[PDB]
Amino acid sequence: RGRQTYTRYQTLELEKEFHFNRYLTRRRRIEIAHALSLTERQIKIWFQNRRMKWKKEN
DNA sequence: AGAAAGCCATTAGAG
DNA sequence: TCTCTAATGGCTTTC
Ligand code: NI
């Protein structure tokens, strides 16, 4: 498969949202997806991984 | 219900 | 070659 590298801007915006909502509703994923020029799935997967990054650091 | 979203462990593509 | 993390597959849980 192929892989896309997320810019400083995209990662920062994602991380910014994560401070407020650890989980996203479907309408908000699509918002961010458009705001960051990412697909819905990428926003879904990102938050999943970041939730995992957050549990270990606790 | 039954898809969609989650959890979680595991790969692998870029730089 | 190494490292970081985007993406994957299996299940189970949500709603
Ligand atoms: Ni069922």
Side-chain angles (χ1 to χ4, degrees), chain A residues 43-57:
Chain A
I43 304 300
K44 175 190 291 180
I45 297 165
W46 189 93
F47 271 81
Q48 196 60 66
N49 293 334
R50 183 64 178 89
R51 274 184 231 116
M52 293 303 105
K53 182 183 184 160
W54 187 83
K55 65 174 283 193
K56 293 172 183 176
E57 298 179 356

Side-chain angles (χ1 to χ4, degrees), chain A residues 1-52:
Chain A
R1 56 185 179 264
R3 161 169 176 153
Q4 168 182 7
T5 300
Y6 301 164
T7 74
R8 185 202 51 85
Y9 178 78
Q10 297 175 332
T11 303
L12 185 57
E13 283 293 302
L14 290 163
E15 199 69 35
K16 168 204 196 177
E17 186 72 33
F18 193 82
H19 185 89
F20 302 99
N21 309 285
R22 291 193 199 291
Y23 294 86
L24 280 193
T25 69
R26 177 180 190 91
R27 182 180 300 165
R28 269 55 188 121
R29 272 147 54 189
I30 299 181
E31 264 182 3
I32 282 176
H34 291 189
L36 302 186
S37 316
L38 296 178
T39 70
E40 177 176 355
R41 190 181 176 69
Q42 299 183 259
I43 304 300
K44 175 190 291 180
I45 297 165
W46 189 93
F47 271 81
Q48 196 60 66
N49 293 334
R50 183 64 178 89
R51 274 184 231 116
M52 293 303 105

